[PDB]
Amino acid sequence: ALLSFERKYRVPGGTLVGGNLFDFWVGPFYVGFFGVATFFFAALGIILIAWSAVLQGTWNPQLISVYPPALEYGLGGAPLAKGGLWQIITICATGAFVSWALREVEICRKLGIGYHIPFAFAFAILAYLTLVLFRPVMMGAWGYAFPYGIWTHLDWVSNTGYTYGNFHYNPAHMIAISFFFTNALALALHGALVLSAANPEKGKEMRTPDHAATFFRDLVGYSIGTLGIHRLGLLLSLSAVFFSALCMIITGTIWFDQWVDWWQWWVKLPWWANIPGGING
Amino acid sequence: DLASLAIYSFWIFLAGLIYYLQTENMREGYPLENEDGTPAANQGPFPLPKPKTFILPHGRGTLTVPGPESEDRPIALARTAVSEGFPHAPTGDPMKDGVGPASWVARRDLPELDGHGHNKIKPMKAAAGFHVSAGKNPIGLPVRGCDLEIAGKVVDIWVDIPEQMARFLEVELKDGSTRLLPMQMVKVQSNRVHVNALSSDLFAGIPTIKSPTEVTLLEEDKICGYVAGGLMYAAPKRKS
Amino acid sequence: AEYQNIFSQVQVRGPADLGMTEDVNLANRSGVGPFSTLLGWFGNAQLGPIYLGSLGVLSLFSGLMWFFTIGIWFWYQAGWNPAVFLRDLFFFSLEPPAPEYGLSFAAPLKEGGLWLIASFFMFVAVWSWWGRTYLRAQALGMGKHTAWAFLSAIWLWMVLGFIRPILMGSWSEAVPYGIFSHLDWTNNFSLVHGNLFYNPFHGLSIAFLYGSALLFAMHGATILAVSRFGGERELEQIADRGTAAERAYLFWRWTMGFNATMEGIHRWAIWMAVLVTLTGGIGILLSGTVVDNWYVWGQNHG
Numbered sequence: 092a093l094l095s096f097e098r099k100y101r102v103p104g105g106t107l108v109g110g111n112l113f114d115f116w117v118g119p120f121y122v123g124f125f126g127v128a129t130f131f132f133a134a135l136g137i138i139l140i141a142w143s144a145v146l147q148g149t150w151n152p153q154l155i156s157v158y159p160p161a162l163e164y165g166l167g168g169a170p171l172a173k174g175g176l177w178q179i180i181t182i183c184a185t186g187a188f189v190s191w192a193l194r195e196v197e198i199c200r201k202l203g204i205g206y207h208i209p210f211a212f213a214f215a216i217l218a219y220l221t222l223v224l225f226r227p228v229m230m231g232a233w234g235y236a237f238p239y240g241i242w243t244h245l246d247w248v249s250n251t252g253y254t255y256g257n258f259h260y261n262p263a264h265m266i267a268i269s270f271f272f273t274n275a276l277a278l279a280l281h282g283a284l285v286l287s288a289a290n291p292e293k294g295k296e297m298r299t300p301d302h303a304a305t306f307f308r309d310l311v312g313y314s315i316g317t318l319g320i321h322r323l324g325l326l327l328s329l330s331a332v333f334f335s336a337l338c339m340i341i342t343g344t345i346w347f348d349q350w351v352d353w354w355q356w357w358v359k360l361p362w363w364a365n366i367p368g369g370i371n372g
Numbered sequence: 373d374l375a376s377l378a379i380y381s382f383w384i385f386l387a388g389l390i391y392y393l394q395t396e397n398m399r400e401g402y403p404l405e406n407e408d409g410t411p412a413a414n415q416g417p418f419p420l421p422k423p424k425t426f427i428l429p430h431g432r433g434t435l436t437v438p439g440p441e442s443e444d445r446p447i448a449l450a451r452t453a454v455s456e457g458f459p460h461a462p463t464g465d466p467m468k469d470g471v472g473p474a475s476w477v478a479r480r481d482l483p484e485l486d487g488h489g490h491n492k493i494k495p496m497k498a499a500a501g502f503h504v505s506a507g508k509n510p511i512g513l514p515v516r517g518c519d520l521e522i523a524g525k526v527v528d529i530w531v532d533i534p535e536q537m538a539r540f541l542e543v544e545l546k547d548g549s550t551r552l553l554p555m556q557m558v559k560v561q562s563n564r565v566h567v568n569a570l571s572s573d574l575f576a577g578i579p580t581i582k583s584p585t586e587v588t589l590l591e592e593d594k595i596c597g598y599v600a601g602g603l604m605y606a607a608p609k610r611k612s
Numbered sequence: 613a614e615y616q617n618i619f620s621q622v623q624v625r626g627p628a629d630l631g632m633t634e635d636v637n638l639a640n641r642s643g644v645g646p647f648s649t650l651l652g653w654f655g656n657a658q659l660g661p662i663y664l665g666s667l668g669v670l671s672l673f674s675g676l677m678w679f680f681t682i683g684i685w686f687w688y689q690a691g692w693n694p695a696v697f698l699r700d701l702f703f704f705s706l707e708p709p710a711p712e713y714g715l716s717f718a719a720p721l722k723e724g725g726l727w728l729i730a731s732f733f734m735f736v737a738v739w740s741w742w743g744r745t746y747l748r749a750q751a752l753g754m755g756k757h758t759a760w761a762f763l764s765a766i767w768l769w770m771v772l773g774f775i776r777p778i779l780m781g782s783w784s785e786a787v788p789y790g791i792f793s794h795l796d797w798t799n800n801f802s803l804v805h806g807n808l809f810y811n812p813f814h815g816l817s818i819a820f821l822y823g824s825a826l827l828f829a830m831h832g833a834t835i836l837a838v839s840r841f842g843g844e845r846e847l848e849q850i851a852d853r854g855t856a857a858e859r860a861y862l863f864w865r866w867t868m869g870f871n872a873t874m875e876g877i878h879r880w881a882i883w884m885a886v887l888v889t890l891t892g893g894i895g896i897l898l899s900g901t902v903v904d905n906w907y908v909w910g911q912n913h914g
């Protein structure tokens with residue numbers, strides 16, 4: 092049930108809501124008021140999923156699909172079988188997510204640590220809310236949202252993308268990807284650096300963080316340090332997701348033509364627009 | 373076909389890999405224990421990994437994990453229920469006792485050393501050639517506690533030499549004794565340094581270091597521990 | 613508000629760290645560079661020294677030759693015009709030889725030969741630089757995780773412009789050097805193989821990419837959350853666990869039921885990242901060589 096050093100940390104307090112009521116653990120897990128909230132929202136949203144699956148007439152996860160209301164229902168409420176179920180589920184999902192974040196906050200307090208984790212998580216939540224709430228509302232209907240289905244959500248992504256030609260041309264999407272690739276680069280390096288210092292050549296002593304620093308200064312002539320690469324990581328990852336949200340929120344709202352055509356602006360700047368040759372002349 | 377082969381292969385690789393990764397993350401805090409310190413009956417689907425040994429620099433010895441784990445200090449906590457899974461209430465002063473968010477670990481009563489074998493962290497007066505290069509210089513500023521009362525004055529910066537990082541502010545209290553304050557728990561303002569975690573009357577409680585040019589892993593832990601604990605335990609003395 | 617720890621509040625400066633010496637040839641190290649008070653607010657401010665050396669130079673030289681052999685092609689496309697060059701910069705492309713030449717190196721300059729030269733330069737740049745990550749680590753007596761992790765990345769790049777074009781029978785199957793052109797090639801590559809969303813490796817690869825974001829966000833935030841106990845000093849925390857590690861392990865344990873160690877999470881880190889291009893590499897290598905259309909393959913599995 093406890094790690095050899097856990098007990099001295101399992102002290103009362105830190106709860107946001109409800110005092111000592113739910114201030115306790117279940118095995119390794121911390122409950123807290125929001126422990127309950129998320130359990131409640133999760134049980135519910137799952138039963139509502141099992142329920143859509145019968146209306147669909149399939150017990151196969153590769154087939155189960157919970158679709159949003161159709162483009163005719165606008166931003167009104169749809170019947171259960173015709174999109175209502177997906178709305179309740181979204182409410183439930185969002186409820187689960189937020190609750191899961193606030194529990195993280197409650198654990199943070201009990202342990203006397205920083206709130207950087209619930210904070211970073213909120214970016215993920217904002218991305219999801221962008222795709223099923225912010226965008227559709229701004230667009231004008233709940234069916235612009237993606238379905239809750241393993242493969243169908245992929246269908247939605249492919250179809251939404253192609254609605255604007257090659258989505259690669261979305262400028263914000265370019266920068267968002269750049270961050271995803273860079274973050275993965277930095278994660279591989281960071282992990283590799285620490286391990287190589289902690290696990291040297293055979294028989295040699297554990298390297299020092301001064302070695303790790305040197306190694307990198309030698310390689311590319313600069314070392315960000317141990318508080319630095321951790322600040323870096325948090326940032327790249329949060330940024331990736333921030334730009335992801337932006338590329339979507341603008342797509343279909345303030346730009347609805349082909350993304351590739353938006354680049355005409357650069358090219359149709361008066362100083363070099365009518366000048367011959369090249370590719371665009 | 374080949375593709376089918378490859379993907380089935382991969383899902384197998386991945387499983388042993390998630391297995392490898394899981395056991396390697398058990399080199400500490402296991403075996404699991406009941407709240408009374410006796411080994412728990414259920415330790416999970418996963419065995420303990422075979423020990424590994426760390427050869428630590430500056431002839432400071434070896435570390436073999438997993439290995440015999442021991443708190444190596446009395447824990448001033450008492451059960452609050454008759455069944456497992458409930459909080460344990462401090463039996464004294466949590467801050468002074470070092471339990472809850474104010475907890476510390478019985479690390480080494482030796483300072484962390486740089487790649488060369490010199491003390492990693494040094495007070496700036498003894499760190500030849502170091503100076504504040506950017507931002508507001510803290511040294512000389514009054515230190516204010518959450519109760520909005522002055523507790524002392526900043527009389528130096530404890531700097532990390534290999535990283536050239538400000539780790540702690542050395543503070544001078546009303547009686548002339550100093551304490552170390554972690555650099556992550558203080559807000560450097562233009563006309564003062566503000567400490568949200570501790571009220572003025574608790575600064576004296578900040579554990580002291582046995583030598584004025586060193587800090588040990590043990591003292592860092594007791595100090596960082598104590599100050600963080602203030603967030604929950606100083607609460608009744610923190611204002612808006 | 614409380615200090616969040618993203619940016620340093622105070623910068624102190626001291627004599628420049630010429631770093632560790634171990635088995636390294638100091639004759640080959642540069643001088644230390646300036647200090648950036650900019651780089652200083654987020655990470656260390658110290659630039660250099662750097663280690664140049666036979667392999668550093670070869671790499672660097674080939675690296676510029678790659679970069680320039682493309683540059684000269686673009687300018688010529690531009691009609692040697694600086695106004696055009698800047699208006700049409702993403703539209704330029706240096707393309708592989710026609711399917712006509714297969715895997716022959718006799719294709720002409722304006723029609724593909726130039727692409728081979730560039731690639732040649734790139735091939736040498738990247739491998740030498742790889743050797744560089746292995747040696748630099750050896751000279752300090754460190755593990756070689758950084759070199760093996762990098763190999764993962766090289767795997768995908770190798771498959772993309774060398775191994776797949778060669779197994780298909782022609783250099784035209786390779787990727788062009790251009791901004792908008794390599795994107796097109798990518799979109800097109802999926803259209804031709806029956807939509808890559810149906811390739812189980814592509815899907816795996818995305819999971820690890822998304823995950824990398826997931827994990828680095830998770831790790832970065834945790835360490836900053838416990839830096840108030842010197843959590844960022846992970847190696848000594850490994851050698852002698854602090855209340856920084858215990859709080860880290862218990863946060864994740866109380867939240868999701870299990871946890872890592874200070875060394876462990878870094879193992880979880882290097883694999884989640886390395887699996888991105890490993891899986892990736894495989895997904896692409898099988899595309900067109902063994903499987904012509906993932907939709908069709910998805911319907912049977914074989």
Ligand code: BCL
Pocket residue numbers: 137219222237241242244245248809814815816818819820822823826
């Ligand atoms: C954000 C970008 C796009 C999108 C584009 C894609 C693309 C492109 C791909 C996926 C893939 C996946 N997507 Mg998606 N996906 C979106 C939004 C979502 C949502 C959501 C609520 O917002 C979720 C939960 C998922 C979940 C998933 C997984 C089924 C799968 C692997 C992801 C992963 O490794 O992440 C990293 C996270 C982790 C490793 C942590 C653990 C995650 C586990 C796997 C979560 C599984 C949940 C799932 C089984 C449903 C449970 C819900 C109920 C409680 C039962 N996507 C939006 C619309 N998604 C890949 C796939 O192969 O699936 C077909 C793929 O190729």
Ligand code: BCL
Pocket residue numbers: 188215216217218219221222248249250251252253257258259264267268271332334335336337338339798799
């Ligand atoms: C044909 C397809 C088009 C295209 C169409 C789109 C569209 C359309 C979208 C993207 C989006 C994205 N694209 Mg694109 N894109 C293409 C090609 C690419 C390739 C490429 C190499 O070609 C790359 C690298 C990317 C990369 C990306 C990312 C920038 C982004 C997806 C991640 C994200 O948004 O996280 C966001 C993260 C989340 C939503 C996850 C939230 C998770 C929540 C908070 C919690 C999950 C809990 C879960 C239920 C737990 C289950 C319980 C269990 C216990 C686990 N695209 C092509 C050109 N792209 C998506 C985006 O930007 O969204 C905003 C999107 O909608």
Ligand code: BCL
Pocket residue numbers: 248272275737738765766768769772797798799800801802807808809813814817818821888889891892893895896
């Ligand atoms: C229309 C587009 C198609 C599609 C077609 C492809 C193709 C084609 C490929 C990918 C690939 C990938 N796709 Mg896809 N993909 C689509 C939609 C998506 C979506 C989405 C819809 O949300 C997402 C999230 C992704 C995500 C991804 C990545 C997981 C994956 C590449 C990983 C990587 O980091 O490589 C980035 C890393 C590298 C390329 C390694 C290179 C390393 C070298 C050595 C670097 C040298 C640098 C050199 C020295 C010069 C640098 C300059 C100096 C620094 C100055 N795809 C749709 C279906 N996708 C790749 C893959 O693996 O697929 C299985 C791939 O080949």
Ligand SMILES: CC[C@H]1c2cc3[nH]c4c(c3C)C(=O)[C@H](C(=O)OC)c4c3nc(cc4[nH]c(cc(n2)[C@@H]1C)c(C(C)=O)c4C)[C@@H](C)[C@@H]3CCC(=O)OC/C=C(\C)CCC[C@H](C)CCC[C@H](C)CCCC(C)C
Pocket residue numbers: 129132133136137180183184187188191195208209211212214215238239240241244328329332822823825826829830833867868
């Ligand atoms: C912002 C940067 C990235 C990020 C960060 C991040 N994620 C996080 C955190 C952080 C910092 C956490 O602290 C938290 C965590 O605890 O991790 C272990 C979390 C987490 N990120 C998760 C998943 C996740 N994160 C993702 C993305 C990302 N997370 C980013 C790329 C993705 C994808 C698709 O990229 C996924 C799948 C969880 C593992 C965990 C949060 C767990 C949680 O919220 O539990 C509460 C909810 C439930 C127990 C289930 C609720 C069931 C619903 C009511 C119904 C199901 C509805 C659903 C909409 C169906 C979707 C079906 C699909 C097939 C489409």
Ligand SMILES: COC(C)(C)C(=O)C/C=C(\C)CC/C=C(\C)CC/C=C(\C)CCCC/C(C)=C/CC[C@H](C)CC/C=C(\C)CCC=C(C)C
Pocket residue numbers: 679680682683684686728731732734735769770771772773774787788789790791794
């Ligand atoms: C500043 O202005 C001047 C004029 C000085 C410049 O020089 C400017 C220069 C620029 C404008 C340069 C711009 C360069 C880019 C836009 C480049 C972009 C490159 C990419 C998008 C590349 C993407 C993908 C590349 C891939 C996957 C390459 C793979 C290469 C290989 C695996 C190498 C394979 C080897 C070959 C075929 C030959 C092998 C032969 C042997 C004998 C072994």
Ligand SMILES: CCCCCCCCCCCC[N+](C)(C)[O-]
Pocket residue numbers: 390812813815816819823883884
């Ligand atoms: C580092 C361990 C975590 C790995 C995450 C494994 C779950 C990913 C599931 C992806 C679903 C994939 N597939 C093959 C059907 O496309």
Ligand SMILES: CCCCCCCCCCCC[N+](C)(C)[O-]
Pocket residue numbers: 119416868869870
């Ligand atoms: C590839 C998908 C993996 C999803 C894993 C589901 C959540 C894992 C939580 C395990 C917690 C374990 N426990 C109860 C033994 O402590």
Ligand SMILES: [Fe+3]
Pocket residue numbers: 281285321831835846878
């Ligand atoms: Fe780390």
